[PDB]
Design a binder for this molecule. Structure first.
Ligand SMILES: Cc1cc2nc3c(=O)[nH]c(=O)nc-3n(C[C@H](O)[C@H](O)[C@H](O)COP(=O)(O)OP(=O)(O)OC[C@H]3O[C@@H](n4cnc5c(N)ncnc54)[C@H](O)[C@@H]3O)c2cc1C
Ligand SMILES: *[C@@H]1O[C@H](CO)[C@@H](O[C@@H]2O[C@H](CO)[C@@H](O)[C@H](O)[C@H]2NC(C)=O)[C@H](O)[C@H]1NC(C)=O
Length: 459
């Protein structure tokens, strides 16, 4: 059968590969941008390539092998380093000057970890139907016996690092049942490894694609006509017998099926019109799940003024305004002598920041840094990079997050096809939504579902 795959991100390339492996090679991959990889994407900053999207292989050294690891660590050998969060207690900055006492902070961290641990025990006892689920915040109130969760600045930044920095939305919106504990770590291990290779984390996608799409022998560039870049799909028409897909440049294509890999945010936006309209059950499942935003703000300075050394890689700023420029990283190992710092924000701050200029954001960050390093002469950043994923119509966010209120059955409706319209992508991964390995396995699973229906008529 002929199949059109919308999008050349990890799940699209992964699904096309699986299909090709089942012998379905009459494929047509339509990608909106001028390159493949989607949310795995590097860029030059300060004369170095940094990751605008995914940057870590998460879940390593555990009971099961994360399928992406071997590709990164063995097959391509992309340069990488295990992240160590053990020294955070020595690195939490007060809103107005210097770090807090390390012992005081380690105990707050312990308390937070301990509460989360009781949350894990509780979560195991809830019903599969989701009828007793609650937000992570509700679990914190119940385990701590208080009318509120973390609320002083230090407690809040610790809370932000433990949950928002992983999920990109606050614990009060997040489903406990479906995030605590998280399958990624429970299955693949607790370690995470930061990819810092000039070829980019995206090389993994290029590698997969080259296993079945044609590449030039000199360049190594993909030259297979089954892949077409700069094709923005704007309309997908379907009937019991087949589909037609129209692109923004006016091309029109036909096929027996279509495999949609665009992000949940793109699907919540209407960039793609379905005709007829998707059924109400489908539409509701789409809008009830969350597409979060995680913004990696890179900064380059004329000289270093922050600490380097053991346990210095990650540091937090305990603002009295929850989530305000709170999680920092320095790259002495990754990009030695580069003078770059990375601050990450999410959710509300991400949408506010994408809407203002870089200069304005730079100025807000300079004020925080000066407050953090009162003894130093902090030079202004010479350059800044603010990724605008939420504003980008082809992504509208960075990764899904599971909100309280949605149960497994409704999450599964996200994965469900509609007639001949199939869906794939990280938001359809059964237990790994939000990750690169989740996009990867999702392409395989979605492809297998279409293969069984199309080839064996077992739908
Ligand atoms: C800032 C950020 C940080 C993250 N951190 C990590 C991390 O460190 N580790 C990790 O494991 N995961 C992380 N993730 C999540 C991970 O990158 C994603 O889960 C995964 O790459 C998503 O792949 P996908 O194929 O599901 O979607 P995408 O990568 O979005 O692929 C979809 C493709 O469809 C295209 N498209 C969209 N609309 C159309 C249209 N109308 N027509 C045609 N094509 C279209 C897009 O251009 C894109 O190429 C991060 C993501 C981001 C953005
Ligand atoms: C990631 O890959 C490196 C690259 O092979 C691993 O380091 C090697 O592992 C073997 C295994 O017996 C040694 O014999 C080699 O000497 C190692 N090379 C180096 C430079 O140490 C490393 O352990 C891998 N990490 C993970 C998490 O799998």
């Amino acid at each position: 059968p002929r199949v059109i795959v919308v999008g050349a991100g990890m799940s699209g390339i992964s699904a096309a590969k699986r299909l090709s492996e089942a012998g379905i090679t009459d494929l047509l991959i339509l990608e909106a941008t001028d390159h493949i990889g989607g949310r795995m994407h590097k860029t030059n900053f300060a004369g170095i390539n940094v990751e605008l999207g995914a940057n870590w292989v998460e879940g390593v050294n555990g009971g099961k092998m994360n399928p992406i690891w071997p590709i990164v660590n063995s097959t391509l050998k992309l340069r990488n380093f295990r992240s160590d969060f053990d020294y955070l207690a020595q690195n939490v900055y007060k809103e107005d000057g210097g770090v807090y006492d390390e012992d005081y902070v380690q105990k707050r961290i312990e308390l937070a970890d301990s509460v989360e641990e009781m949350g894990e025990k509780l979560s195991a006892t809830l019903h599969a139907s989701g009828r007793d689920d609650m937000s992570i915040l509700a679990m914190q109130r119940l385990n701590e016996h208080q009318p509120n969760g973390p609320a002083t600045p230090v407690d809040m930044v610790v809370d932000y690092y433990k949950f928002d920095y992983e999920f990109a939305e606050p614990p009060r919106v997040t489903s406990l049942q479906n995030t605590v504990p998280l399958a990624t770590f429970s299955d693949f291990g607790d370690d995470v490894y930061f990819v810092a290779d000039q070829r980019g984390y995206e090389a993994v996608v290029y590698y997969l694609a080259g296993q079945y799409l044609k590449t030039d022998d000199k360049s190594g560039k993909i030259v297979d006509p089954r892949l077409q870049l700069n094709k923005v799909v704007r309309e997908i028409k379907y009937s019991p017998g087949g589909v037609t897909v129209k692109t923004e440049d006016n091309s029109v294509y036909s096929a027996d099926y279509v495999m949609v890999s665009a992000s949940l945010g793109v699907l919540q936006s209407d960039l793609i019109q379905f005709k007829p309209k998707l059924p109400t059950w489908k539409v509701r499942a789409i809008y009830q799940f969350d597409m979060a935003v995680y913004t990696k703000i890179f900064l380059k300075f004329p000289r270093k003024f922050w600490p380097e050394g053991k346990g210095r890689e990650f540091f937090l700023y305990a603002s009295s305004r929850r989530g305000y420029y709170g999680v920092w990283q320095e790259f002495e190992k990754q990009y030695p002598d580069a003078n770059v710092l990375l601050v990450t924000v999410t959710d509300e701050e991400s949408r506010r920041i994408e809407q203002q200029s870089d200069e304005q954001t730079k100025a807000e960050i300079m004020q925080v840094l000066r407050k953090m390093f009162p003894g130093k002469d902090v030079p202004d950043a010479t350059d800044i990079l603010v990724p605008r994923w939420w504003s980008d119509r082809f992504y509208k966010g960075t990764f899904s997050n599971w909100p309280v209120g949605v149960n497994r059955y409704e999450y599964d409706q996200l994965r469900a096809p509609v007639g001949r319209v199939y869906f794939t992508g990280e938001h359809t991964s059964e237990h790994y939504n939000g990750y690169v390995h989740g996009a990867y396995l999702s392409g395989i699973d979605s492809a297998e579902i279409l293969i069984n229906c199309a080839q064996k008529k077992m739908c």
